[PDB]
UniProtKB/Swiss-Prot annotation, chains A, B:
Entry PTM: Phosphorylation dependent on the nitrogen source and spectral light quality.
Organism of this sequence: Synechocystis sp. (strain ATCC 27184 / PCC 6803 / Kazusa)
Gene designation per UniProt: glnB
Keyword Transcription: yes
SUPFAM superfamilies associated with the record: GlnB-like
Entry protein name: Nitrogen regulatory protein P-II
Keywords in alphabetical order: Nucleotide-binding, Phosphoprotein, Transcription, Transcription regulation
GO biological process, alphabetically ordered: regulation of nitrogen utilization
Record note on quaternary structure: Homotrimer.
Matches recorded under Pfam families: P-II (PF00543)
Cellular component terms per the entry's GO annotation: cytosol
Cleaved signal peptide residues: none
Family: Belongs to the P(II) protein family.
Length: 94, 94, 95
């Protein structure tokens, strides 16, 4: 599992959401941030190793405009994910 | 050392806070996020490996309602925690 | 490549921004958070190279500290890669 954090332009949320849905990603977290100011949107998703490259490419395509200030995507390790409702703990290790 | 971040229903803040305090956890960071939507709160804490299971369990018990949309908890590696007031840096191998 | 997350007193933003600028740090994301009772804080996120971490943390602490309880925390974690959205360039850093 990897955490994918995309800092995008606010108006790119919808096409990014569509790109994620069509990519099989269920669930994402969004928050407002200031990118140094310019208002930006932080999107957080945690996906399996196999779909990381695919998601990033979909995210880049959807969030891209071509001009300066398009943002960045950060990829970081996540050991486990726990579903609160059931207490189900999923751990992925190399 | 692990970063434990929980995305919970906003009305679960107080009970999660209580659970965390009773569990010996001192200090948490709370941010407002939108979970795709519904308003959610992101709770961040950092703890030693030997506390993770216990902390996650208290977190699940406190944040759950049994209804779909209870949220999730992500466990990830943290290299260091620095206390700004004292400048003390606490580092652990990942 | 490390993620540096600093939770600081809101009024320390400008000092921290200045510290990071003359430290060669370009780009940071800032958000409002509550540090627990509740106290308004600012979350500053930056991703720097391994060789910059120690220096950046030192500058951050010097900038954000007051000496009073509640000055905040800085969490340092691993980042596998950084992808520039515009060009699609994936940057990885290792040793
Ligand atoms: Ca749009
Ligand atoms: Ca409650």
């Amino acid at each position: 599992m990897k955490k994918v954090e995309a800092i995008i332009r606010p108006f790119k949320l919808d096409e990014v959401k569509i790109a994620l849905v069509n990519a099989g990603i269920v669930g994402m977290t969004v928050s407002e941030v200031r990118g140094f100011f310019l208002q930006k949107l932080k999107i957080e998703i945690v996906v399996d190793e196999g779909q990381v490259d695919m998601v990033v490419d979909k995210l880049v395509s959807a969030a891209r405009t071509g001009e300066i200030g398009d943002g960045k995507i950060f990829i970081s390790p996540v050991d486990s994910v726990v579903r609160i409702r059931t207490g189900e703990k999923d751990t992925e290790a190399i």
